[PDB]
Design a protein around this nucleic acid. Sequence first.
DNA 1: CGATATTAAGAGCC
DNA 2: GGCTCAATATCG
Length: 73
Amino acid sequence: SDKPKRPLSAFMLWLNSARESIKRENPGIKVTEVAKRGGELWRAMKDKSEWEAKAAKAKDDYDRAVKEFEANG
DNA sequence: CGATATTAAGAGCC
DNA sequence: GGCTCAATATCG
């Protein structure tokens, strides 16, 4: 199928798991507080190759889905 | 289905 | 070359 949900950053990949880790320490948080805590934690996260490999995988399937967007429009 | 709220890195739309 | 992308939780 055409029209993909676009690819993500290495940040967004980690933020989804960090949301659950931040919920364990702060009960009032949802997503925007996790984005602020996220900014300070990602600044200190060297060797981010897990997060970079997962977003690079999403970029390859995005390029595949985008090829079908030109085949169907 | 589309709009509100916060933060980042990559390659696309036409 | 200005605009595009989630992730989670709710209402028009």
